[PDB]
Amino acid sequence: GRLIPAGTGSDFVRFTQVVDQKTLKAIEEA
């Protein structure tokens, strides 16, 4: 019943991250 290792379950694309430029700069400078 775990996440299948394909598509959105492939390690290749699974660990991708999303961040808006406002938070992006907020963490970058800090």
Added chain:
Amino acid sequence: YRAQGVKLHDKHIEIVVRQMMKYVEVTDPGDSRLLEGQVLEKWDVEALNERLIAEGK
């Protein structure tokens, strides 16, 4: 499938046929622990061979 009017890529059949050739048989163990007649995956026996022939065995 061609005779029945079905256009199907050979690619898919190649996938399955590839899975048919996935196994090999030992004709001589050498310095390994394997036995004559023992059947195993080709990837594993090539991994053992690269671990043996590079070990000098």
Added chain:
Amino acid sequence: TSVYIEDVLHEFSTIPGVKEDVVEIILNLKELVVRFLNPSLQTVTLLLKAEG
């Protein structure tokens, strides 16, 4: 738009002495054509009583 028969609870009933079932009688009342002489009249409740 509506029908009430004495001693009849629902459309699927059957009236003693009467050949037609309630569903059929209602179906016949659909064919009824009632003209209103007065344009101000939007509803009429008719009465029917017969036997023998």
Added chain:
Amino acid sequence: PVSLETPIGDEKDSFYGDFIPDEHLPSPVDAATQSLLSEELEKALSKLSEREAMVLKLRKGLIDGREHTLEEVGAFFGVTRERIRQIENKALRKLKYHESRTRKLRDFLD
């Protein structure tokens, strides 16, 4: 008793026990309702002070899971048992007025 593996139909693809629901394990509705009741009750007990709500939480067994007599609650808070019964009367009465106004806990009466 009758077997749960009793054949249903002339095929072998169906069993008797397949049509029997589980009456024990809580449906998601039950667990959600129980959680909503605990949350709404805590929302109701926060309309009181911490002391007069603690008297009730110890009285009916919300905390620790034990219902206490007036002597034990009085032995804890440090007041007389009649003071505890007085506090619990005031707290319940406040919760009655809170209920009469808010109309929140009413749906949980089941």
Added chain:
Amino acid sequence: PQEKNSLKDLVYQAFLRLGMEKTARLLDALKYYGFTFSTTSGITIGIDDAVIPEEKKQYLEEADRKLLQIEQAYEMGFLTDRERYDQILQLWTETTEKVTQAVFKNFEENYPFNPLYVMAQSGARGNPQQIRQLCGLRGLMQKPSGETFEVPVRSSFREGLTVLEYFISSHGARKGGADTALRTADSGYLTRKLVDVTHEIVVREADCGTTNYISVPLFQPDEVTRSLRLRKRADIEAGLYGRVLAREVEVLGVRLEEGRYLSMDDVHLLIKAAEAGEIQEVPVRSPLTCQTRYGVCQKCYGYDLSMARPVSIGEAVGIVAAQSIGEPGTQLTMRTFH
């Protein structure tokens, strides 16, 4: 005139050029105007629309006189029972063909807008075999054991069948119904086999870096003429379209680089260059040679045939492969009765 094939090539070309979204809007548009024009077209079906050709009676008489000539050649002991059986089958087969072509030639010439002919030509519904049964003779029916009956069904569905012809028809019809009901259990079984052996095959990496490949032949060694001739178009398309070259191929003044995803036009070009005689086989990256562990790579696979673009890493290939192989097998078994 627009029909199934021309519209299909339109959808494919629209998908390549204009993308998914606009192609989808094109589909909705074709759907709308298609329906709106079909309803006011005036296409109906009456018993007179199944046009029995004047040739049919003549071919029946000719077949009957030929039948009695075979009997004439039998009772004198000239030929075997097997020989008369084969000649009777061959007779009614040729007769059937002559009748069918007479139906559609009569349709094209005299009644070119006849509903049956319209729905057949456009690919909107039927094929000449069914239409023949409506107009010309039904043809030969087979014994459930196999083979074929000596006596054919001479009637059509318009003329009306004799109870004998209907009974002989019920023999084959029962076998067809049994095919869609029982025989399908074999194909579906194969499908599950293919899935279980390919279920772990996924596109994992971009390139396994293999230096190996396969040679896709553009010519098949005939046994008849004993000379290598060009293979059929669709077959070559099924073996080249959406693949990746492992070697550079330069023909007809065109460079095809190594790592090039062959488009449909690239394949058509390769076929024309093969007819020129510049190339006889095409080197291509194949899963057969791919050295990616526990699956395949993007370059060895090629196009994701649904998107007509390089396969996305992570796409479960093995499942798709197993599905797309077993699907026509089971589906065609359901259509045996047609």
Added chain:
Amino acid sequence: RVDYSGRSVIVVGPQLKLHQCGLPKRMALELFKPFLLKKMEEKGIAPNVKAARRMLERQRDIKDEVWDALEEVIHGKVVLLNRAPTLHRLGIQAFQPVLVEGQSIQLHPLVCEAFNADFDGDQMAVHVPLSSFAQAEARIQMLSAHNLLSPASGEPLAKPSRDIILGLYY
């Protein structure tokens, strides 16, 4: 066997866009029942979840406010239509539901070739992807309009057929 899954008889939906399907309000009410409960509490149709669910459990206690609320619920969200037997991957496809009067599921004509489904009485199952992740997977990968070619042959899988071919040929 999974929750949030319904089933009904399919009906041709020529008016639908390729990415859409018709869905009964009754089915949509039950399939999105927890979502409908929350949205009802967000509005003034019910004080809380318990009273709202008690309201839905009686047909004559249903008023138009819960329908328009349900309209706000399923907006942007998609469902999955499945037709047995599932022979290939297009046996399941994602569609944006369109609430309709009646107890039938409306299916877009062009995908009838992909599902291999005619309207001689065929039925279909409706599964509802819950998580935002599952919703994203359906709307992108499994959406009907996003799949126009056959993964088998590469040829157009969703193409004009029957009435459409006839009309254009005419």
Added chain:
Amino acid sequence: MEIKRFGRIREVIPLPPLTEIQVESYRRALQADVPPEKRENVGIQAAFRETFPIEELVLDFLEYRLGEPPFPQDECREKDLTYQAPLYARLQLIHKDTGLIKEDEVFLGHIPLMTEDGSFIINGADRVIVSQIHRSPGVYFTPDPARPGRYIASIIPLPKRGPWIDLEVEPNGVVSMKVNKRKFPLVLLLRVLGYDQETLARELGAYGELVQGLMDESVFAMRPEEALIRLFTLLRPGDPPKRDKAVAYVYGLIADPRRYDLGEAGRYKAEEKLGIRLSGRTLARFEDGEFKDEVFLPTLRYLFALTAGVPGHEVDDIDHLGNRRIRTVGELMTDQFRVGLARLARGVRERMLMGSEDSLTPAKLVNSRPLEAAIREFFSRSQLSQFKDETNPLSSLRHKRRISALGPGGLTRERAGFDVRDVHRTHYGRICPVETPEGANIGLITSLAAYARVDELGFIRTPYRRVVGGVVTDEVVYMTATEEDRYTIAQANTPLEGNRIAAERVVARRKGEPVIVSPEEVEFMDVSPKQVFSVNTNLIPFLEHDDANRALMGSNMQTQAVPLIRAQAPVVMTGLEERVVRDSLAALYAEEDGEVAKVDGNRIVVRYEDGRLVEYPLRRFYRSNQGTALDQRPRVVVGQRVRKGDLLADGPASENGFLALGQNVLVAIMPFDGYNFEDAIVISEELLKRDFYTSIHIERYEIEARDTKLGPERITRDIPHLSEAALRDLDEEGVVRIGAEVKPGDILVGRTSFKGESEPTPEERLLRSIFGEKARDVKDTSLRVPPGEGGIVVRTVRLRRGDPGVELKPGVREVVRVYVAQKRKLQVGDKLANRHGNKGVVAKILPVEDMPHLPDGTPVDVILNPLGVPSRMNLGQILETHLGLAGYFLGQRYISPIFDGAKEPEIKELLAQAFEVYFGKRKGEGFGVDKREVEVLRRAEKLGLVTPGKTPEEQLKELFLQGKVVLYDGRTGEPIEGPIVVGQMFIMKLYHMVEDKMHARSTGPYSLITQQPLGGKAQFGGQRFGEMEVWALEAYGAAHTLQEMLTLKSDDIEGRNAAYEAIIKGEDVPEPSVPESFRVLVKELQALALDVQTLDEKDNPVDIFEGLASK
């Protein structure tokens, strides 16, 4: 209206009683109306005679008798009882030593009786016992699939009675015999029979190189007794070779009439096959102290003669209907009666040697329970005992003519194969080559042909007209398949002038093979084309113009037709429509000539020639097995003078005696905006206005108030924590009032049950304390309305305990049932279909103004897609539309016999006559040709449909003859650019409706072990996501959608509770936990003593049970 018919064929004999295979069989097995002294030996009587007497005290059988039913039929249907009759048995206990004779009549329980129509009633439900088809007993010789020149001999007795025997010549030369999975030389068995080398040498010596393998000197070296002992050591290893013990086993295995039993049919089959005669039905006999042969020598004779290639010896087709027979209801019930009676006999033998050897009576010695259990078993949990199809009269009528190869003694689904599923040449006139289920039972389940009946041996016989010379005699001869193979039988449509054959070369049949032959060589002739097909297949007009596949659909779907309230007979009939409502007991007729006294909806009273007053109570609004309302409607008025066999009251789905499975609607065959895309159908709103395709459906809702250890369940109007608005339509006893309207959520019957003992959670304790209301002692468990259902309550049946006449099953106090009906109009999703196989669902209900209409302003009812016609190859509906159009304007109906029906030129004639009424009316009203009609005509003569130059009236007639008319699009006013075929078609509304099917589920009941959602609409279950649907998601690559189905949406408990909680809180769903079904797998694997451990990358054990499984 006038009824015009066609055809030149005059069928002599009418169709036999259609339910005869049920009634005449069961009665023949009972002989309850036959005086015991004049009773023959069959069925129940044969069972008593075969099981009696009991050897060891001797208990003997005299005679039995059957009393009258304790309750009438409708009373059994009402009180959920079984329609049956008491069985008494006269027995005399005789002491073989003393001579003491004690006689008494013992009671053996009840035996279920068959109703008039041929069905049964088992515990309040109508049930049909379907006849069984199997291999006839006897001796068959089938070619050995291994050795080409060698053959397999098979000796087959009745099912369950005796083993099968295989005689085979081995490669080593000796003939072998196989019994009960044991092979041995046949020579030994022959020796036991008393045979010698002499007898076998003179008898079998005709064939050399064969009998020498039968010759073994070591076999003749021992006496018959020694050979018998030798054989017993072969069949029974380990068991002591005692003489009397060996005699007992071998005799019981072969010669015993009680254990081993050939069929009386199998007896005759063996006699005719081997050219001999058999005294009994056993392969051998025990006479004068030893074993005497009967069957084995002639069989071995035929076998060796077959292998040698001796003329006069053939193999046997096992699919041949001369080698396949039918076990009707009577024989099936008898066989099970034999088994139960045998068990009772074992009880007798057991109780004789026990208890008093002196004082015993037939009453004391008899235990009826084994017999009761056996009969009750056969009528309940048997496969051939099926739920009666009471959809329409035709449904049950066909159901009683069903033939199954399945059931006990039949074929398993995996044991089937398509060799038996095919059609044989012997099926001609016997078994319908068309009617069959298109499911997994195709070929196994079939229907009996019309003119066909089953003889006493169990084979199916068909009538044939006697033909001598050129004269065709009116006498008819029913023949078996083996007998039919002897003669040359011509066609029914062969030209006949008077009784004399006219044709020079007729079409005939010799052993199934068609042959053009002379009238001097014609021995017999087909009675009618109708005998080839089943009853349902006979109800399809223009059958010869339809594909066999869609004909199958038509025959099957007519069974699925719901009786409409305005149902009408088809405009184009085949002639059997009346006869169906005759043989089926739907309608009602007058017994003798007489006058009508009273007419009512409830009853019809008639005074006859006898003067006696007979009152017929009418069945009204009674719920059938499928929910279709079955009511009878009076068709006569007060004072009406009737005759013998005249219609009194029309039953369900019947119009003036004729069968009404649907309605005659005005159809138009044209594409319509893709709403008829792929078999879809567009209808007019007018069909709903005048209530076409409207039918009443009733549903039965039951509830039980039982005794619990926690306290009684009480049905009352008092339900805790409920509003008065919800208790509206209930009476004071808790039952809903009759005539009220109920919707989903409403309470049909209120019931209270005491709460299970449990500590109320502290939250609940505080909640009770706050609201100042003590918790109610009881709990609400009420029978409510299932989602998607409802209607009007017409009846309420309340049974209790303590009140007279009613006693329920132990623990139950009172049983209350509610009957809720509903009138169902035609809505989008319901399934419409015709008799020619055309099917589809209603995809659109257009307002009348959008509907395509005639020039005179008449809108069509149904819009059918022409694309459905050519690929499906059923042109019958086209002709039905044509003749329906001509009959529409002429105002007359038609009868078109199958294969003998109306032909095109006659239809053209009737169309022309209809055209005169059509256009002649117009031109008489002072209206010329429409300008749009001009354009249509222009495009029509460009279409080559009409001859150019002719006047518009001549052209419009040329189109009308083709069945096409000018149609106007209601939306535009502009005409359709071409002429369209329009006419009346008989279309039925099938049982499959969206009201019965549509289902949706958020959350609901979960299974016990798996803890996964249940299945089906009835159980409010979820939809199955099979491994194929898993593949579909996998192939897509949608991991989180698949993980959803595998956890949160099904099997994960914590995850789904937190999920539901999250959604109603507006929060996103939680991360899915490990499924419960895998934990079940783990522990089930541990029960198999296999350790299954979940690990991390450190190979250290991970506990998915979270400490609950570890100490």
Added chain:
Amino acid sequence: AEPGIDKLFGMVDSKYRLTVVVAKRAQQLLRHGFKNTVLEPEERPKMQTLEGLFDDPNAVTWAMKELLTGRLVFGENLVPEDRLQKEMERLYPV
């Protein structure tokens, strides 16, 4: 079809990565109450109601729209997860 689906497929190396990006961004938006959006007031996806046009309740629509803007950053190992979470709750309280 989803608006500008071809552009979105062109933005990533594999279409499944696009799905992950959309899903995760929609999760951020749904959790923080749509106040962390990069969409200008005129770019806000609306929904037709009986009252008037309100914001689109579907976070997935917002995610794909934001992705079309090109104002988002997608990739791997760009930031400690705990840091991103607590910082987004700092700027946009939940």
Added chain:
DNA sequence: TATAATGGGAGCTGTCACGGATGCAGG
């Protein structure tokens, strides 16, 4: 807790085609 009693009873026969292990006679 006491005459003496001492080796069972019903088989389900109309699938089929595969892999692999057992056993047989033959070179």
Added chain:
DNA sequence: CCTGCATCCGTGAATCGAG
């Protein structure tokens, strides 16, 4: 004594509905 062929036993045999 060791290979080869005959033969034995055990295992499979589409999906979803309802029932």
